[PDB]
Paper text:
The linkage structures are at lower resolution than that of the leaf, so we fitted our leaf structure as a rigid body to assess which subunits are close to one another in the linkages. Consistent with our previously published structures the central contacts in linkages I and IV are made by the αε-COP subunits, and those in linkage II are made by the δ-COP MHD. Interestingly neither ε-COP nor the δ-COP MHD are essential for COPI function and the combined deletion of both is not lethal for yeast. The slightly improved resolution of the linkage structures obtained here compared to our previously published maps showed that the density that we interpret as being contributed by a flexible hydrophobic loop of the N-terminal β-propeller of α-COP, is in the vicinity of γ-COP in a neighbouring triad.
Coatomer (the COPI complex) is a heteroheptameric protein complex, consisting of α, β, β’, γ, δ, ε and ζ subunits. Arf1-GTP recruits the protein complex coatomer from the cytoplasm and anchors it at the membrane. Polymerization of coatomer at the membrane assembles the COPI coat, which recruits cargo molecules and membrane machinery to the assembly site.
Residue numbers in the entry:
A (entry chain E): 17 to 308
B (entry chain A): 913 to 1225
Amino acid sequence: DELFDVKNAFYIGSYQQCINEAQRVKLSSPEREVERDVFLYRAYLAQRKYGVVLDEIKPSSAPELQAVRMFAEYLASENQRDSIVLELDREMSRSVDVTNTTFLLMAASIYFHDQNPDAALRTLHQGDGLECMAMTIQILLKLDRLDLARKELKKMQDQDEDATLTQLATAWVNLAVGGEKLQEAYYIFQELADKCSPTLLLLNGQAACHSAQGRWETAEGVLQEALDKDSGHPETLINLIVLSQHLGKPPEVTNRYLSQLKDAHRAHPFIKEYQAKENDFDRLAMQYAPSA
Amino acid sequence: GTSPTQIWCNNSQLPVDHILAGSFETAMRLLHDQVGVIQFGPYKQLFLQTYARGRTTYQALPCLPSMYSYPNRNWKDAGLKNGVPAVGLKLNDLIQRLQLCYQLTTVGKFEEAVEKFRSILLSVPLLVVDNKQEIAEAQQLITICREYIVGLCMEIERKKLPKETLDQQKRICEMAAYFTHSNLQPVHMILVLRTALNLFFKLKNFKTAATFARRLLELGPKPEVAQQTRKILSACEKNPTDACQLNYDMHNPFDICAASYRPIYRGKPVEKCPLSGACYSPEFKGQICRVTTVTEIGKDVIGLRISPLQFRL
């Protein structure tokens, strides 16, 4: 696979690396060229550079790109989403085409955000690709059906044990499993970071593994390193808040990270949940509180 | 399937566990039954703070929603079924904070001290305690907090009341005397005794003053204070006598009404805060505890449930 580096960089989480390499790579095939562009834009989406994707991908572009763009608009425009899903539903039902894997992944992604796990899973079921399998496992884990997840993992495991995508998948299942497994997950994350490069994604994964186990202090270094690279990184800040409390840092510290998160991303679901909790708490207070 | 947070809720009675889970309503209920906590409002910061720490996050795939991890204190043994949230707050932490409270009391920062004390007191129910004795310490820790809170709060008021009437003065001395009873550490206990002695001296209730002086000396205050105390004591001896009768019985056991700051002798009916142990006169029952601020005075409760040891089968 010529694209191997580009894709691999993408999965690990080093988007810029993916973008840089994608450009360097030569097409050598109308097919490959399309795949390259797909990843290139996918990388931009990870970066959250929606405008880049929306502007550059134009109607004349290949359908694979179109799917990517579809996802991009979904992420970019909140208003557009219901309309997009409706169309997605229509396209999904009124059209058989399984072959376009990219379409399935993008479509599944939209459903995933839509929180229609069934639809996303339904779509993924059709897709053959290894990535489809990985995405499938991830959805199952969110579903909290580890058992189903395990089956898919082995499914991919038989196909390609060594693939990084497979390894990441195993780590995920692993993290979910708990127990001795956690160490296994830790090593895979560590190995990837060592081989490829510490990515924010990889660092947090390692931290999560350590945190799952008692080792709060060990976690400090990875988070600290991650924070240094990108302040405002959502996973990092959240982990820091959790880590800070275990460490016994001053309560202000936990608060500071939390506030920092709001600055970086007002929208972030973690923030929304936090707000939601505040609301019901007030609601509950009234319930218990004495009347006057 | 079943979410890990839910598993935690099913698994543990402890309130902190539920808060970590995010099950506020459940947690509040537990606090309501186990301890009196009617008024949750002072709790809000604790809940959110506790809640924030509950789960970690990592990203499975790019451009997808991030995954959440739920750490378990019994990670090794806990299967999918028997997980329980990691700790995060411990008894030692609370105990350590206590020193700061002591420091503030000495400085005279009483109002701030009350806040720190109350903060700790409220936090006690949050703890997960490993062993039986450790449970006792927690209870003891709570007791210390209320003792200071009621005592300090009484003191703040006493200063506020007017000096002018003789009756007003008798009131002040009485309150000062009540403080004497509070079970504080010797550094503080000495300080209060020192104050009471002066008030009683001016009151010309020398006989009572002498007793305070003797108690103070036993504590072993610094030498300057001790010398001063001896001086006052000798003066008192010249005319051992109390000019006025006060509503204070050094010998009879007391219980200070947290609200009224009036003595409740031995057997006399009292209503107590389920959580703090603070005492109130029967009138108060059903009202929000001044000390705790969260609890209901009258409420009957299961009792604090910090550790799983408490549950038996």
